[PDB]
Amino acid sequence: NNLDSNVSQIVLKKFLPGFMSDLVLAKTVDRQLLAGEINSSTGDSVSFKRP
Amino acid sequence: PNNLDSNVSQIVLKKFLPGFMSDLVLAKTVDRQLLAGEINSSTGDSVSFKRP
């Protein structure tokens, strides 16, 4: 009868897994042309020529 | 309050973007050796080949 004070409420130190997404578009778009071209001197924007 | 747009310059890089084009198969397939070099100064503007 009334043994509640003997036991204690415990929370385990385990995190349940969640939801994750995948990334494929960032690895396919071109990144070599616009690589470091925007500097302190260049400013806000940079431009490329057209054929 | 800061207005630093006159400390920089607008730069146009020296690179060209790709464009478009098409393939050529009709030029390669048709015959070219028969008519090559036959038309010259002494042949006017036409030359003929016989028939079987």
Side-chain angles (χ1 to χ4, degrees):
Chain A
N1 293 114
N2 221 37
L3 268 172
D4 215 348
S5 298
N6 211 2
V7 296
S8 71
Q9 293 82 17
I10 310 293
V11 170
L12 261 66
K13 306 195 171 315
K14 288 93 171 152
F15 281 94
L16 298 171
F19 311 90
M20 171 175 278
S21 175
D22 49 22
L23 312 172
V24 298
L25 293 171
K27 283 93 185 157
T28 64
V29 297
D30 169 87
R31 291 203 269 182
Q32 283 333 298
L33 291 175
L34 192 64
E37 314 274 30
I38 288 189
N39 276 328
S40 67
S41 167
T42 61
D44 199 2
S45 84
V46 74
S47 301
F48 309 102
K49 289 181 196 174
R50 270 168 152 97
Chain B
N2 280 324
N3 197 338
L4 265 66
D5 67 338
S6 300
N7 203 1
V8 289
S9 43
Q10 287 84 343
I11 304 299
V12 175
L13 296 178
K14 292 161 136 66
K15 292 142 202 293
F16 284 84
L17 304 164
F20 308 85
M21 73 291 291
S22 60
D23 48 23
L24 282 84
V25 299
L26 295 174
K28 314 212 211 313
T29 49
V30 299
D31 189 309
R32 306 210 31 190
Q33 64 182 357
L34 276 73
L35 214 64
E38 300 299 328
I39 306 195
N40 56 55
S41 300
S42 307
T43 76
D45 68 279
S46 79
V47 67
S48 308
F49 313 90
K50 313 181 154 184
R51 289 278 168 81

